[PDB]
Ligand binder design. Structure first.
Ligand SMILES: [Zn+2]
Length: 255
Protein backbone atom coordinates (compact mmCIF):
# COMPACT_ATOMS: atom_id res chain seq x y z
CA UNK A 1 0.00 0.00 0.00
CA UNK A 2 2.24 2.83 -0.99
CA UNK A 3 0.73 6.24 -0.40
CA UNK A 4 3.84 8.38 -0.67
CA UNK A 5 5.07 10.77 -3.38
CA UNK A 6 6.82 7.92 -5.17
CA UNK A 7 4.85 4.69 -4.57
CA UNK A 8 1.27 5.88 -4.21
CA UNK A 9 -1.90 4.65 -5.93
CA UNK A 10 -0.80 5.89 -9.36
CA UNK A 11 2.08 3.36 -9.23
CA UNK A 12 0.14 0.27 -8.11
CA UNK A 13 -0.79 -0.84 -11.64
CA UNK A 14 2.84 -1.82 -12.32
CA UNK A 15 2.70 -4.61 -9.72
CA UNK A 16 -1.06 -5.21 -9.88
CA UNK A 17 -2.37 -4.77 -13.46
CA UNK A 18 -5.93 -5.29 -12.19
CA UNK A 19 -5.53 -1.74 -10.88
CA UNK A 20 -6.78 -0.72 -14.35
CA UNK A 21 -9.53 -3.33 -14.37
CA UNK A 22 -13.22 -3.15 -15.06
CA UNK A 23 -14.59 -3.10 -11.51
CA UNK A 24 -12.11 -1.09 -9.41
CA UNK A 25 -12.93 0.79 -6.22
CA UNK A 26 -13.51 3.33 -4.89
CA UNK A 27 -15.74 5.31 -7.19
CA UNK A 28 -17.52 8.64 -7.16
CA UNK A 29 -21.20 8.16 -6.25
CA UNK A 30 -23.22 10.51 -8.47
CA UNK A 31 -26.38 10.76 -6.47
CA UNK A 32 -28.39 11.92 -9.50
CA UNK A 33 -27.42 8.92 -11.65
CA UNK A 34 -27.81 6.23 -8.95
CA UNK A 35 -31.18 4.59 -9.18
CA UNK A 36 -33.56 3.43 -6.52
CA UNK A 37 -33.91 -0.36 -6.73
CA UNK A 38 -37.09 -1.81 -5.24
CA UNK A 39 -35.62 -5.32 -5.66
CA UNK A 40 -33.19 -4.68 -2.82
CA UNK A 41 -34.19 -6.58 0.33
CA UNK A 42 -33.80 -4.99 3.77
CA UNK A 43 -30.18 -4.76 5.04
CA UNK A 44 -29.50 -6.75 8.24
CA UNK A 45 -26.55 -5.80 10.40
CA UNK A 46 -26.34 -8.43 13.11
CA UNK A 47 -23.46 -7.50 15.42
CA UNK A 48 -24.85 -8.40 18.83
CA UNK A 49 -22.50 -11.35 19.28
CA UNK A 50 -19.40 -9.69 17.81
CA UNK A 51 -16.14 -10.77 19.38
CA UNK A 52 -13.33 -8.31 18.83
CA UNK A 53 -9.84 -9.67 19.42
CA UNK A 54 -7.03 -7.33 18.58
CA UNK A 55 -6.00 -4.07 16.95
CA UNK A 56 -3.01 -4.09 14.53
CA UNK A 57 -1.03 -1.38 12.72
CA UNK A 58 -0.22 -3.10 9.44
CA UNK A 59 1.65 -0.17 7.89
CA UNK A 60 -1.35 0.81 5.68
CA UNK A 61 -4.05 1.44 8.33
CA UNK A 62 -5.04 -0.11 11.66
CA UNK A 63 -7.35 -3.17 11.64
CA UNK A 64 -9.67 -4.14 14.49
CA UNK A 65 -9.92 -7.91 14.10
CA UNK A 66 -12.82 -10.17 15.01
CA UNK A 67 -13.34 -13.84 15.71
CA UNK A 68 -14.84 -15.09 12.45
CA UNK A 69 -14.71 -18.81 13.19
CA UNK A 70 -18.50 -18.80 13.75
CA UNK A 71 -21.42 -16.55 12.60
CA UNK A 72 -21.05 -14.08 15.50
CA UNK A 73 -21.23 -10.77 13.58
CA UNK A 74 -22.77 -10.97 10.14
CA UNK A 75 -24.20 -8.86 7.39
CA UNK A 76 -27.15 -10.15 5.32
CA UNK A 77 -29.88 -8.75 3.13
CA UNK A 78 -29.64 -5.77 0.84
CA UNK A 79 -27.99 -6.78 -2.41
CA UNK A 80 -26.46 -9.81 -0.68
CA UNK A 81 -27.21 -13.49 -1.10
CA UNK A 82 -26.36 -15.54 1.97
CA UNK A 83 -24.29 -14.69 4.98
CA UNK A 84 -21.21 -12.55 5.29
CA UNK A 85 -19.03 -12.71 8.37
CA UNK A 86 -17.24 -9.72 9.90
CA UNK A 87 -13.47 -10.24 9.87
CA UNK A 88 -12.07 -6.73 10.57
CA UNK A 89 -12.69 -3.05 10.19
CA UNK A 90 -10.29 -0.24 9.39
CA UNK A 91 -10.35 3.39 8.26
CA UNK A 92 -8.82 5.60 5.61
CA UNK A 93 -8.24 9.29 6.44
CA UNK A 94 -6.56 12.45 5.38
CA UNK A 95 -3.98 14.95 6.45
CA UNK A 96 -6.69 17.66 6.37
CA UNK A 97 -10.38 17.52 7.26
CA UNK A 98 -11.38 18.09 3.60
CA UNK A 99 -9.91 14.82 2.35
CA UNK A 100 -9.51 11.20 3.46
CA UNK A 101 -12.48 9.25 2.14
CA UNK A 102 -12.10 6.81 -0.73
CA UNK A 103 -15.60 6.97 -2.09
CA UNK A 104 -16.89 10.46 -2.86
CA UNK A 105 -20.47 11.66 -3.12
CA UNK A 106 -21.06 14.06 -5.98
CA UNK A 107 -17.28 14.56 -5.85
CA UNK A 108 -17.41 15.50 -2.11
CA UNK A 109 -14.55 14.04 -0.06
CA UNK A 110 -15.15 13.30 3.64
CA UNK A 111 -12.49 13.42 6.35
CA UNK A 112 -12.32 9.64 6.62
CA UNK A 113 -14.06 6.39 5.64
CA UNK A 114 -14.75 3.32 7.81
CA UNK A 115 -14.67 -0.12 6.10
CA UNK A 116 -16.31 -3.09 7.87
CA UNK A 117 -15.03 -6.09 5.86
CA UNK A 118 -17.11 -9.28 5.63
CA UNK A 119 -16.61 -12.57 3.79
CA UNK A 120 -19.19 -14.87 2.22
CA UNK A 121 -19.39 -18.01 4.34
CA UNK A 122 -20.17 -20.21 1.33
CA UNK A 123 -16.47 -20.01 0.46
CA UNK A 124 -15.25 -21.31 3.83
CA UNK A 125 -12.41 -18.88 4.54
CA UNK A 126 -11.36 -15.34 3.71
CA UNK A 127 -8.55 -16.33 1.41
CA UNK A 128 -10.89 -18.39 -0.78
CA UNK A 129 -13.55 -15.69 -0.68
CA UNK A 130 -11.29 -13.01 -2.10
CA UNK A 131 -10.90 -15.18 -5.22
CA UNK A 132 -14.63 -14.95 -5.96
CA UNK A 133 -16.66 -12.14 -7.55
CA UNK A 134 -19.14 -12.26 -4.68
CA UNK A 135 -16.65 -13.12 -2.00
CA UNK A 136 -16.68 -10.02 0.19
CA UNK A 137 -19.13 -7.39 1.35
CA UNK A 138 -17.67 -4.14 2.60
CA UNK A 139 -19.86 -1.71 4.56
CA UNK A 140 -18.52 1.80 4.02
CA UNK A 141 -19.31 4.66 6.36
CA UNK A 142 -18.19 8.25 5.90
CA UNK A 143 -16.73 10.31 8.75
CA UNK A 144 -17.19 14.08 8.95
CA UNK A 145 -15.56 16.27 11.60
CA UNK A 146 -17.97 17.79 14.11
CA UNK A 147 -19.08 16.35 17.43
CA UNK A 148 -17.25 13.43 19.01
CA UNK A 149 -18.35 9.89 18.34
CA UNK A 150 -18.46 8.21 21.80
CA UNK A 151 -18.33 4.71 20.27
CA UNK A 152 -15.02 5.53 18.60
CA UNK A 153 -13.16 6.72 21.69
CA UNK A 154 -11.99 3.25 22.84
CA UNK A 155 -10.32 2.92 19.44
CA UNK A 156 -8.72 6.39 19.62
CA UNK A 157 -7.28 5.73 23.03
CA UNK A 158 -5.46 2.48 22.12
CA UNK A 159 -3.72 4.04 19.14
CA UNK A 160 -0.80 5.20 21.27
CA UNK A 161 0.04 1.53 21.84
CA UNK A 162 0.17 0.67 18.12
CA UNK A 163 1.97 3.72 16.77
CA UNK A 164 4.23 1.90 14.35
CA UNK A 165 3.97 -0.79 11.72
CA UNK A 166 3.75 -4.29 13.11
CA UNK A 167 2.50 -3.34 16.58
CA UNK A 168 -0.72 -4.93 17.90
CA UNK A 169 -2.67 -4.77 21.15
CA UNK A 170 -5.45 -6.73 22.77
CA UNK A 171 -8.79 -5.21 21.82
CA UNK A 172 -11.55 -7.33 23.33
CA UNK A 173 -15.16 -6.44 24.02
CA UNK A 174 -15.45 -3.60 21.49
CA UNK A 175 -18.92 -3.16 20.05
CA UNK A 176 -18.88 -2.08 16.39
CA UNK A 177 -22.57 -1.07 16.61
CA UNK A 178 -21.27 2.15 18.19
CA UNK A 179 -19.78 3.16 14.84
CA UNK A 180 -23.02 3.02 12.84
CA UNK A 181 -25.14 6.04 11.84
CA UNK A 182 -28.90 6.10 12.58
CA UNK A 183 -29.98 5.33 9.04
CA UNK A 184 -28.95 2.25 7.02
CA UNK A 185 -29.89 3.86 3.64
CA UNK A 186 -27.11 2.96 1.25
CA UNK A 187 -25.75 2.85 -2.26
CA UNK A 188 -24.40 -0.45 -3.66
CA UNK A 189 -22.25 -1.46 -6.62
CA UNK A 190 -19.77 -4.26 -7.55
CA UNK A 191 -16.13 -3.38 -6.98
CA UNK A 192 -12.80 -4.26 -5.54
CA UNK A 193 -10.48 -4.08 -2.60
CA UNK A 194 -9.03 -0.59 -2.48
CA UNK A 195 -5.53 -1.72 -1.50
CA UNK A 196 -3.26 -4.23 -3.20
CA UNK A 197 -3.99 -6.80 -4.39
CA UNK A 198 -7.05 -4.85 -5.58
CA UNK A 199 -9.02 -8.01 -6.19
CA UNK A 200 -12.42 -7.61 -7.79
CA UNK A 201 -14.36 -9.51 -5.17
CA UNK A 202 -16.39 -6.91 -3.30
CA UNK A 203 -20.04 -5.99 -3.11
CA UNK A 204 -19.82 -2.42 -1.81
CA UNK A 205 -22.53 -1.12 0.48
CA UNK A 206 -21.90 2.58 1.22
CA UNK A 207 -24.14 4.27 3.80
CA UNK A 208 -25.53 7.64 2.87
CA UNK A 209 -25.50 9.11 6.38
CA UNK A 210 -22.03 9.97 7.70
CA UNK A 211 -21.04 9.65 11.28
CA UNK A 212 -19.52 12.64 13.06
CA UNK A 213 -16.22 12.46 14.88
CA UNK A 214 -14.32 15.26 16.63
CA UNK A 215 -11.25 17.09 15.48
CA UNK A 216 -9.38 15.64 18.45
CA UNK A 217 -10.37 12.06 17.50
CA UNK A 218 -9.18 12.38 13.88
CA UNK A 219 -5.99 14.19 15.02
CA UNK A 220 -5.09 11.04 16.95
CA UNK A 221 -5.46 8.93 13.77
CA UNK A 222 -2.97 11.28 12.16
CA UNK A 223 -0.34 10.56 14.84
CA UNK A 224 0.02 6.99 13.72
CA UNK A 225 3.02 5.98 11.67
CA UNK A 226 3.48 4.09 8.41
CA UNK A 227 7.03 3.14 9.47
CA UNK A 228 8.20 0.51 11.92
CA UNK A 229 9.67 1.34 15.35
CA UNK A 230 13.16 2.79 15.21
CA UNK A 231 12.70 4.06 11.66
CA UNK A 232 12.35 7.65 10.52
CA UNK A 233 8.88 8.84 11.21
CA UNK A 234 6.33 8.91 8.37
CA UNK A 235 2.91 9.99 9.63
CA UNK A 236 0.08 7.68 8.64
CA UNK A 237 -2.07 10.20 6.72
CA UNK A 238 -3.72 10.28 3.31
CA UNK A 239 -3.94 6.49 3.18
CA UNK A 240 -6.77 6.61 0.63
CA UNK A 241 -7.08 5.61 -3.03
CA UNK A 242 -8.85 8.14 -5.22
CA UNK A 243 -11.98 7.46 -7.25
CA UNK A 244 -11.59 5.02 -10.19
CA UNK A 245 -13.52 4.86 -13.43
CA UNK A 246 -17.06 3.50 -13.10
CA UNK A 247 -16.95 1.83 -16.48
CA UNK A 248 -19.87 -0.55 -17.13
CA UNK A 249 -21.45 -0.32 -13.68
CA UNK A 250 -24.64 0.95 -12.18
CA UNK A 251 -24.86 2.20 -8.62
CA UNK A 252 -28.15 1.34 -6.98
CA UNK A 253 -29.81 3.20 -4.14
CA UNK A 254 -31.80 1.53 -1.37
CA UNK A 255 -33.87 4.69 -0.82
ZN1 LIG B 1 -10.52 0.04 3.28
Amino acid sequence: CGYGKHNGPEHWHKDFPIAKGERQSPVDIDTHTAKYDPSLKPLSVSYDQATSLRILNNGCAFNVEFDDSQDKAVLKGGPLDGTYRLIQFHFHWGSLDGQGSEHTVDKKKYAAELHLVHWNTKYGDFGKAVQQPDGLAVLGIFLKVGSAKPGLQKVVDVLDSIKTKGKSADFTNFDPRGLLPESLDYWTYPGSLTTPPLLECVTWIVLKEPISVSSEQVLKFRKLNFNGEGEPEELMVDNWRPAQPLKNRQIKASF
